[PDB]
Amino acid sequence: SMKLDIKKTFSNRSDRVKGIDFHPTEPWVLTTLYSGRVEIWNYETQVEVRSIQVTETPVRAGKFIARKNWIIVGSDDFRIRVFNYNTGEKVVDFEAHPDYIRSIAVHPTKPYVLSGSDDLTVKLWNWENNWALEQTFEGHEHFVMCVAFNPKDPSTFASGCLDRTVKVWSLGQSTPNFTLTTGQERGVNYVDYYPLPDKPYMITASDDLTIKIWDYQTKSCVATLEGHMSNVSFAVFHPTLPIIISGSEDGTLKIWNSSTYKVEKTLNVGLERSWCIATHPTGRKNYIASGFDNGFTVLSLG
Amino acid sequence: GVKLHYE
């Protein structure tokens, strides 16, 4: 049970959206597209802030680095690129891995970026040390699909991998603090942390149609969420509301109750397959946004 | 070669 007042703030059509992110202080959303283009939209005025044809290959990963006025993007041409969103200047452009970049995460306070790749690794880059490769984390046995810092202790982070595991690592240490054998036999496409201090929870999504919730202190599976009808692209905890939001190649978003783990609402926004998700980092208007085959939508909840 | 999760 839950009162959900879902309003469509802004939707636009585009080529397939593979990455999406909210700016914390401007009413902007970044989308990164399978066509190699990236777009920054003001979702309040419904005007494009800036767009860039970055490459000819898919750009699967993109984040704002608001404290530097940057976007950082990673693509199937193996490269990390950074642009200043006020000028359009390309700040850096380097080959980060010898294979596709699937995911980029930004540390909340330090000048660190993580990239996960089909090269089986996560790499740590330091933009205050000339974008040095500070560490490579080895141990996964298939494509690393998702990386995320623990917001409550960002000296640690999680990687989710098609080898059916999540590994949680400490910066400066070469082996995982622990590996979760998820039992998601078709791999892990996504891993996320519950953001508030009261629960030490993580969440994983899989091509096996399931979402699983994990306690990272006991390393136990708390719940398995079933209901999606095709590959689950992502599942996240909302930063302010007691819900989980997932999206799937079945074309739906699902909102699940984070206490009972039962589905509360299924949304078919009409843009075909869902690939990516963002939640507004301050909880502004409880905003979420998702990217799909045929465009993106920004929704306000409750 | 074949690339999983190509889309």
TrEMBL record, chain A:
Highest taxon above the source species: Eukaryota
Swiss-Prot/TrEMBL WD repeat ranges: 10-51, 94-135, 137-179, 197-224, 225-266
Cell compartment(s), UniProt: Cytoplasmic vesicle, COPI-coated vesicle membrane; Golgi apparatus membrane
Membrane-spanning intervals of the chain: none
Family the entry assigns: Belongs to the WD repeat COPB2 family.
Function statement: The coatomer is a cytosolic protein complex that binds to dilysine motifs and reversibly associates with Golgi non-clathrin-coated vesicles, which further mediate biosynthetic protein transport from the ER, via the Golgi up to the trans Golgi network. Coatomer complex is required for budding from Golgi membranes, and is essential for the retrograde Golgi-to-ER transport of dilysine-tagged proteins.
Subunit architecture: Oligomeric complex that consists of at least the alpha, beta, beta', gamma, delta, epsilon and zeta subunits.
Protein name: Coatomer subunit beta'
Organism name: Saccharomyces cerevisiae (strain Kyokai no. 7 / NBRC 101557) (Baker's yeast)
